[PDB]
């Protein structure tokens, strides 16, 4: 109508979830989104669905299939001819997946009655929103509340400018049409290492340049050392304190200069991915505003209930503090929607799981052991290795471990971290119990189906107290 | 002779864990076991390690990889030759898995310091146990407590007796050296369809002949139905209501007659698996009278705590009442050792997960829906398909669903049931919520990572409450 209860600008996982939940709570909801995808029409779901979460998980699943037929089929007595990938077909499948899914979300807001404005939306004083359509149409809307879910973008570095051809960000990467001979990845983060894995399993030699002292500094210290080892055994070369000073591309490959034990220069990679960071988009989102503050780093100031400086305007997901993860932005969206309707809601930020979907998966919930040491919580810890799981052994999949950490005085579970088969699923079991204030004895006292990979969390909980059966 | 605090008869999953846990508690414990593994020596582990759990999953994983490369790799642009199999290698790999795990259990009891006696153990009157070594050397050992965990064996049927060549039970079906081109399975339960799925995938035209006309009674009906369709689509031809009348082992094949409303005989399979049930084993454990009562069906009579009629004697696993599962045996073992050393334990027989490790895998916990309706309880059901899941789509593993059954009055969760990818893990996350007293609304409020198969549980709980993001 001319009025709305809530207008959400940006339809990413925070944004379109914000929207469906606000409509489900009976508010007249609008949704503004400007992104048109790969088949010419607007494509909802954001970075995650279109150039993110679903694109990289899909290519990681296809490039794992390749690598199993290649390395271990023989251990199963399975013989194949020479196995070969068709990279246009693989990318076509992925694109068919983002097509299905884009479409799904679109039916979901129509069935749910949200009104979707296709254009750019910017917040005016008095919480009116001006929507500018492709041609330059301008339309302002009235609403009672605004929810800014504008998300983020690739950090951009001076020594290596992307041109979406020889040098690329995470989007260019996901759409290559052939495996590159040599691929450099700048940034050893979650995105860096996933994309690095994908093409190295298909055939690229891959070097992952990282400037920081440490490998994966936010993952538990024992889980990360184990991951460094295994990812390097599959030929990701991760050079850990490299600063790149410049790049040059004579016509079709890029020579990078960097400093790490020497002042070195890598023979001109055929592809370079730039995966140094993501950062918040505030591009034309606000007028000299409905007084919305930005912080020194570019994030929209919100409080702990994602409410800005302007009553009724909230900002959620990637433009705001916290982990830049899809489930953080979505739960920020439903929590926010509920505060606008049937108030009683706050998000627990101390229990959002983090997953990298590599060979094996790395995942963790709660606090890491090194963080527990900096504000001296005496911890007890139990660990159980998938080499000791008869289930993982049957699946020919024995790498990694489960790590359970507990309070040494009346052992409430403080962290569950794991690198292994199904890391996402077992950490979610760790997380569901943490939510009910579990101890390791609760976990240990439970009936876990056999054989199941789950048994290795049951056994890491038995082990906090030193009474695991299949190890000691 | 030597004098003990606990003597355990049988080293299957219940009894070898019972012996470890008594050792862990301070009791001089003795293990007795007479199974010789096909290699030569006494092999600990029982029906599950040697000839049940780990064998069937091991074959089930190689056959699905075969099944996958045949018709699945194409979808990712994987240009193979065309998938061939060497079954002699495929069983050799399972035989190593078993050798390594049997070896593992042996090193575990030794480390926990259990005395093993390789022989048959018979309980004599007045708590003393005799062990006969390989050659008739008798020994009577003294103890203040006894745990009989002797086991189960297959139900042999008169129309069709085993000879481990042409007519076989599940042990023999686990050791075939070639793929029968036509296979008959009598019994469409867990065992039956897992061994039929193994060889079907590898090429056997398989028929499952079932005496009841109710497919998978103890499994939630929505799920059993779904399961019957998806399994009939992979080529299992399951005939319900079929009784087999007679067997003609010729020299080539097994001609099997049967009546299924009409009396007919399906052609002459190359091999017949007799998979109708498993019965308890009590053979020579009674002296004349030990004092232990046997039950009318063959079991040993024990109370709710696995105590028999004879005060220092307990009986755990498949020789006793309950779902004949390895995790049920293990847990009763642990519980009996704890109340032996100081009564600090009790187990919940209402939350014991059960899984069929088929092609979608099938798991469930709590009450099935038909049982709830049958005893008049008011329920609300949230159901969520893997077809609408982000991760399943990327994995190309989209079949099936998650069903959360909660009580309509208190919103407490009654049963979790799922046919689909990682069913067993998703039910164990459900068993965990359920152990703590969850409402469907508690799980609906939790943060589940994106993308994840665990999210299909989240959205199922949210769907019990009418308000689930990605469907309705
Ligand atoms: C390669 C990669 C892999 C990732 N993998 C995962 C993963 O597996 N799991 C995970 O949790 N996270 C992952 N992430 C993070 C994840 O995708 C983001 O955290 C998530 O997308 C945050 O969503 P959002 O709603 O805040 O913003 P976004 O998804 O960025 O969506 C914001 C939307 O608002 C729109 N927009 C912006 N301004 C306007 C405007 N002014 N008017 C109209 N429309 C506008 C944009 O077009 C955009 O579509 C990944 C990210 C990448 C790049
Ligand atoms: C094909 C198949 C697949 C299965 N899959 C699964 C699965 O996936 N998950 C699951 O939970 N269950 C599974 N089961 C069942 C599992 O094998 C049993 O539930 C489990 O073995 C029962 O343990 P138990 O300790 O009671 O007995 P058992 O494992 O049978 O162990 C009994 C032991 O007692 C010993 N014994 C008997 N008499 C004496 C004697 N007098 N003296 C000394 N020793 C003796 C035997 O040699 C034997 O090793 C499967 C079974 C089959 C047949």
Asked if the Cβ–Cβ distance from A436 to B431 is below 8 Å, we say: no
Asked if residue B440 lies in contact with residue B245, where contact means CB atoms within 8 angstroms, the answer is no
Which of A422, A265, A394, A344 is CA-nearest to residue B101?
A394
CATH number of B351-472: 3.30.390.30
Tell me whether residue B359 is one of the annotated catalytic residues.
Answer: no
- Mutation choice for A interface testing from B432, B448, B468, B471 by most A CBs within 10 A: B432
Answer for the pair A145, A139: CB distance below 8 angstroms, yes or no. Answer: no
Interface test with B, best of A45, A418, A450, A471 (most B CBs within 10 A): A450
Q: How far apart are CA A220 and CA B292, in angstroms?
A: 53
Contact B33, B150 (CB under 8 A): no
Q: What is the 3-state secondary structure (H, E, C) of B334-401?
A: HHHHHHHHHCCCCCCCCCCCEEECCCCEEEEEECCHHHHHHCCCCEEEEEEEHHHCHHHHHHCCCCCE
The sheet that has A361-366: what strands, in order across it?
Answer: A354-356, A361-366, A413-420, A401-407, A379-385
Q: Which of A67, A450, A458, A470 is flagged as catalytic? A: A450
Q: Residue A252 and residue A180: Cα distance in Å, rounded?
A: 12
Chain pair A-B, CB pairs under 8 angstroms: 256
CA distances from B55 to A451, B24, B178 (A): 11, 29, 16
Q: Which of B327, B450, B467, B470 is catalytic?
A: B450
- A278 pairs with which residues across the strands? A154
A387 three-class SS: helix
Ligand nearest to C-alpha A43: 1
Residue A326 near residue A310, CB atoms below 8 Å:
no
DSSP-H helix ranges across A7-160: 13-24, 46-51, 53-71, 87-111
Cis peptide preceding B188, ω within 30 of 0: no
Strands A140-141 and B146-148: unpaired
Residue-wise burial string across A410-441, b where 16 or more C-beta atoms lie within 10 A, e elsewhere: ebebbbbbbbbbbbbbbbbbbbbbbbeebbbb
**Apex CA A406: angle with CA A402 and CA A412, to 5°?**
125
Q: Whose CA is nearest to atom 38 of ligand 1?
A: A150
Is B297 marked as a binding-site residue?
Answer: no
Sign of CA dihedral A472, B5, B9, B15: negative
- A126, burial (CB in 10 Å: exposed 0-12, middle 13-18, buried 19+): exposed
**Pick from A86, A88, A450: CB nearest B326:** A450
Can you tell me the distance from the alpha carbon of B172 to that of B272, in angstroms, rounded to the nearest whole number?
10
| Rg (chain A; Cα; Å) | 24
* B1-154+277-350 and B155-276, same CATH topology: yes
DSSP per-residue letters across B153-191: EEPP-TTS---SSSEE-HHHHTS-SS--SEEEEE--SHH
Question: Residue B33 corresponds to which tokens in the numbers above?
Answer: 């076991």
Q: How far apart are the first and last CA of chain B?
A: 70
Angstrom distance (rounded) from CA B294 to CA B12: 20
- B237 belongs to an annotated ligand binding site: no
Ligand 1 binding residues, C-beta < 6 A: A 9-15, 32-35, 46-48, 52-53, 56, 120-122, 149-152, 170, 191, 281, 285, 317-318, 324-327, 329; B 450-451
Residue B210's DSSP bridge partners are: B240
Number of H helices, E strands in chain A: 13, 25
- Give the gap in angstroms from C-alpha A246 to the nearest C-alpha of chain B: 36
Question: How would DSSP label each residue in B220-270?
Answer: -HHHHHHHHHHHHHTTEEEEETPEEEEEEE-SS-EEEEEEESEEEEEEEES
**Rounded Cα gap, residues B223 and B362, in angstroms:** 8
Per DSSP, what are the bridge partners of residue B442?
Answer: none
Domain B155-276 sits in CATH 3.50.50.60: yes
DSSP letter for A388, please. Answer: G
Which single residue is written with the structure tokens 């010729």? B250
Per the entry, the structure determination technique was: X-ray
Which residue, among A13, A14, A65, would best test binding to B if mutated, counting the most B CBs under 10 Å from its CB? A65
Q: How far apart are CA A222 and CA B303, in angstroms?
A: 46
Question: Which residue in this structure is represented by tokens 């997960």?
Answer: B353
Q: Whose CA is nearest to atom 53 of ligand 1?
A: A52
Helix, strand, coil percent values for chain A (each to nearest 5): 35, 25, 40
Nearest alpha-carbon partner for B68 in B234, B238, B225: B234
Nearest CA to ligand 2 atom 37: B150
Where b means 16+ CB within 10 Å and e means fewer, B351-376 reads bbbbbbbbbbbbbbbbbbbebbeeee
Query: Which residue of A53, A59, A286 sits with most ligand 1 atoms within 8 Å of its CB, as the best mutation to test the pocket?
Result: A53
A69 and B73: CB-CB below 8 Å? yes
Alpha helices in A112-249 (DSSP H): 170-174, 190-202, 221-233
Residues B319, A277: Cα–Cα separation, whole Å = 60
- Superfamily classification of domain B1-154+277-350: FAD/NAD(P)-binding domain (3.50.50.60)
* Reported structure resolution in angstroms: 2.2
User: How far is residue A352's CA from residue A435's CA, in Å, rounded to a whole number?
Assistant: 11
- The DSSP symbol for B350 reads T
C-beta of residue B166 within 8 angstroms of C-beta of residue B184: no
Residue B290 Cα distances to B128, B150, B286, B314, B398, angstroms: 9, 15, 5, 13, 55
Q: Which residues contact B197 (CB under 8 A, 6 or more apart)?
A: B60, B63, B231, B234, B236, B358, B359
* C-beta atoms of B57 and A20 within 8 A: no
Q: Judge contact between A425 and B425, C-beta under 8 A.
A: yes
Q: How many CB atoms lie within 10 A of CB B81?
A: 12
Q: Which residues of A touch B48 (CB under 8 A)?
A: 450
How far is the C-alpha of B137 from the C-alpha of B125, rounded, in Å? 20
B286: left (phi over 0), alpha (psi -120 to 50) or beta: alpha
Q: What angle do CA A213, A215, A220 make, to 5 degrees?
A: 120
Task: Decide if B426 contacts B457 (C-beta within 8 A).
Answer: yes
- What are the residues facing B415 on neighbouring strands? B366, B405
Q: Do B172 and B183 touch, CB atoms closer than 8 A?
A: no
Residues A357 and B390: their CA atoms lie apart, in Å, by: 14
Domain locations in chain A as residue ranges: 1-154+277-350, 155-276, 351-472
Closest CA to A9 of A218, A287, A256: A287
Closest CA to A33 of A7, A3, A6: A7
Cis peptide before A89 (omega within 30 of 0): no
Q: Is the dihedral angle over the CA atoms B19, B25, B26, B27 positive or is it negative?
A: negative
DSSP per-residue letters across B31-67: EEE-PBPTTSSB--SHHHHHHSHHHHHHHHHHHHHHH
Helix or strand (DSSP H, E) at A313: strand A313-315
Residues in chain B whose C lies over 2.5 Å from the next residue's N (breaks after) = none
Q: Encoding tokens for residue A434?
A: 């943490």
Q: State whether B470 and A104 contact (CB < 8 Å).
A: yes
A194 φ/ψ angles, rounded to the nearest 5 degrees: -65, -40
Which among B386, B395, B333, B457 has a CA at the least distance from the CA of B22?
Answer: B333
Look at B396 and A61 and tell me if their CB atoms are within 8 Å.
yes
The 3-state DSSP class for residue A450 equals coil
Is A237 within 8 Å of A208 (Cβ atoms)?
yes
The neighbouring-strand residues paired with A365 are A416
Q: How far is CA B470 from CA A111, A254, B385, B453, in A?
A: 11, 44, 10, 14
Contact between A396 and B61 (Cβ < 8 Å): yes
* Separation between Cα atoms, residue B135 and residue B131, nearest integer Å: 11
B413, burial (CB in 10 Å: exposed 0-12, middle 13-18, buried 19+): buried
DSSP character for A412?
B
Q: What is the CA radius of gyration of chain B?
A: 24
Report yes or no: B272 and B184 within 8 Å, Cβ to Cβ.
yes
B363 annotated ligand binder: no
Report the run of H or E that residue B207 belongs to, with start and end.
strand B205-210
Separation CA A187–CA B94 (nearest Å): 41
CB A148 within 8 A of CB A313: yes
Q: Going by C-beta distance under 8 Å and a sequence separation of 6 or more, which residues neighbour residue A443?
A: A404, A413, A433, A457, A458, A461, A462
Residues with CB under 6 A from ligand 2: A 450; B 9-15, 32-35, 46-48, 52-53, 56, 120-121, 149-152, 170, 191, 281, 285, 317-318, 324-327, 329
Nearest CB among A90, A394, A467 relative to B54 is that of A394
**Distance, C-alpha A281 to centroid of its chain:** 17
φ, ψ dihedrals at A241, nearest 5°: -140, 50
Question: DSSP states of A66-88 as a string?
Answer: HHHHHHTGGGGTEE-SS-EE-HH
First to last CA, chain A: 67
B136–chain A nearest CA distance, Å: 33
Helices (H), A253-316: none
3-state helix/strand/coil string of A213-260? CCCCCCCCHHHHHHHHHHHHHCCEEEECCCEEEEEEEECCEEEEEEEC
Distance of alpha carbon A140 from alpha carbon A161, whole angstroms: 37
CA distance B341 to chain A (A): 15
The CA distance from A207 to A200, in Å, is: 10
Point out the residue among B69, B442, B449 whose CB comes nearest to the CB of A69. Answer: B69
Contact of A170 with A191, CB cutoff 8 Å: yes
Q: Give, as one character, the DSSP assignment of residue B402.
A: E
CB-CB contact of B393 with A45 (8 Å) = no
Measured CA to CA, the distance from residue A208 to residue A258 in angstroms comes to 12
Residue among B326, B358, B427 whose CB has most ligand 2 atoms within 8 A, to mutate = B326
User: Torsion angle of alpha carbons A165, A166, A171, A176, nearest 10°?
Assistant: 80
Ligand 1 pocket mutation pick from A31, A52, A60, A168 by most atoms within 8 angstroms of CB = A52
**Dihedral in degrees, nearest 10, Cα atoms A449, A450, A451, A455:** 70
Cα-flanking dihedrals φ and ψ of residue A452, to 5°? -145, 150
φ/ψ of B401, rounded to 5, equals -160, 180
- To the question of whether residue B37 is assigned a binding role by annotation, the answer is yes
């Amino acid at each position: 109508s001319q009025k709305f209860d809530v207008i959400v600008i940006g339809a990413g996982p925070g944004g379109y979830v914000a929207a469906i939940k606000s409509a489900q709570l009976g508010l007249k909801t609008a949704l503004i989104e400007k992104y048109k995808g790969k088949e010419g029409k607007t494509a909802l779901g954001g970075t995650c669905l279109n150039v993110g979460c679903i694109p990289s998980k899909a290519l990681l699943d296809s490039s794992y299939k390749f690598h199993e037929a290649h390395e271990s089929f023989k251990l199963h007595g399975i013989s194949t001819g020479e196995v070969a990938i068709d990279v246009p077909t693989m990318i076509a499948r992925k694109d068919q997946i983002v097509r299905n899914l884009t479409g799904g979300v679109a039916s979901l807001i129509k069935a749910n009655g949200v009104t979707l404005f296709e254009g750019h939306g910017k917040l005016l004083a008095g919480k009116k929103v001006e929507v500018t359509a492709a041609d330059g149409s301008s339309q302002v809307l009235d609403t009672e509340n605004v929810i800014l879910a504008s998300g983020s973008k690739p950090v951009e570095i001076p020594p290596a400018p992307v041109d979406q051809d020889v040098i690329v960000d995470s989007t260019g990467a996901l759409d290559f049409q052939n495996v590159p001979g040599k691929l450099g990845v700048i940034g050893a983060g979650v995105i860096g290492l996933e994309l690095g894995s994908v093409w190295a399993r298909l055939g690229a030699e891959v070097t992952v340049l990282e400037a920081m002292d440490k490998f994966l500094p936010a993952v538990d210290e024992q889980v990360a050392k184990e991951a460094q080892k295994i990812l390097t055994k599959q030929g990701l070369k991760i050079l850990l304190g490299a600063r790149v000073t410049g790049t040059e591309v004579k016509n079709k490959q890029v020579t990078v200069k960097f400093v790490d034990a020497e002042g070195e220069k890598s023979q001109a990679f055929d592809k370079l991915i730039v995966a140094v960071g993501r950062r918040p988009v505030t591009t034309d989102l606000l007028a000299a505003d409905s007084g919305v503050t930005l912080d020194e780093r570019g994030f929209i100031y919100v409080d702990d209930y994602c409410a800005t400086s302007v009553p009724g305007v909230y900002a959620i997901g990637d433009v705001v503090r916290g982990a830049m993860l899809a489930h953080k932005a979505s739960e920020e969206g439903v929590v926010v929607a509920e505060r606008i309707a049937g108030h009683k809601a706050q998000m627990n930020y101390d229990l959002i799981p983090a997953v990298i979907y590599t060979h094996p998966e790395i995942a963790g919930v709660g606090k890491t052991e090194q963080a527990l040491k900096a504000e001296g919580v005496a911890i007890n810890v139990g660990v159980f290795p998938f080499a000791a799981s008869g289930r993982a052994m049957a699946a020919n999949d024995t790498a990694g471990f489960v790590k359970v950490i507990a309070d040494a005085k009346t052992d409430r579970v403080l962290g569950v971290h794991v690198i292994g088969p199904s890391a996402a699923e077992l950490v979610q079991q760790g997380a569901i119990a943490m939510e009910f204030g579990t101890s390791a004895e609760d976990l240990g006292m439970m009936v876990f189906a056999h054989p199941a990979l789950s048994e290795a969390l049951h056994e890491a909980a038995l082990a906090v107290s030193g009474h695991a059966i299949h190890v000691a």
